[PDB]
Amino acid sequence: ENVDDYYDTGEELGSGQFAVVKKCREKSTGLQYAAKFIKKRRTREDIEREVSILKEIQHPNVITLHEVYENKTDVILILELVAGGELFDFLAEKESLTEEEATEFLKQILNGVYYLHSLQIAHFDLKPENIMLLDRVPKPRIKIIDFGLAHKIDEFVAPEIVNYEPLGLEADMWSIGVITYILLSGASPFLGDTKQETLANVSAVNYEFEDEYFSNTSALAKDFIRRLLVKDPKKRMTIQDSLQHPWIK
Template sequence: MEGIEYSTQPFEELYEVFEEIGSGQFAVVRRCVEKATCNEYAAKYIRKRRVASSRRGLPLEAIAREVRVLQRLDKHQNIISLHQVFDNGQHVILVLELVRGGELFEHISERERLSEEEASAFLHQILQGLSHMHSKGIAHLDLKPENVLLLSKNRQHIKLIDFGLSREITKAEEVRDLMGK
């Protein structure tokens, strides 16, 4: 992928891969542990489209756009961080910060009620993440409760995830695109 540095070493030489922790239309996310440091991460395996006319997998340009967005967003406290990128031929593997608290949507659904203080804290963090994205000229374009994760079950710290539909935009540019499912 042009302009993107990815490791050429076999992913499994550097990481132990464990259970599936999430999935989407073109990607599967598995927990992994970096062998050298014993640090845990989430490995997002994105299937590459082999033939332009195929519906299986994502075009390389779309994968590269997501990687560039994650790289530009640096390490913000409310945005999932990118650790490394691999290409094994069939998949591009994004090694991401591991977030264990589950979806904000599930957290809210399980509760009988959410206090105004809790709701305000979640909203404040979402807006901080979006403000950071917008300051870098990036629009998320798929913001929904399923794309907001809790850092851990017992903390109210959230992370924005899933930048597959995100776009770099300029103030002079009008963006019109069909998004979502």
């Protein structure tokens, strides 16, 4: 079925390796949507994962799906439009945030993830380029975007089975700590001068609150971060705890 029979195509709002997101006006209603053209591999299922999860969720702080189309070589997702650009870009124009602003972005994000975690959904790609503003208001409104790294979480055996250990919701929480750290400072807590180094940094949980940025940061803000950047997932603060943390109160 032909998407050009229902929507008038606008110009791009984003890119990635195998996806273009362009603005799109619905012929019948005049309403504008964000169309995600995901080019299918010609020789996916990751695309049905993404769709089925987008179909399940509805929350003020997550993006809604509207319809889904398929052509010869792209599979198309008509999605809730979000017009205020990326928190990433708001984060660039602002160089960092006061605690009061960080907390009011962070409250919304927390709420979106709470909701998701209540449905056993893990996002697995929480980061500013995937967080989006509605209107760029002095106290702006966010929507979580970019799904499908999102996943529903539930004697002869080989060594890598014997010590398996599956991934979970806790990975999201870790990203939230990394997001918060960036929110309050210029900076990215683990970045090294090379990818190798950054990966080593993340594994050894090797970060500091350097004075250049954190010299006046509240105890409560440091506490919140420290409690989320914790190597063993079972001791990381959960979504529920994070919403009660007195820095969020």
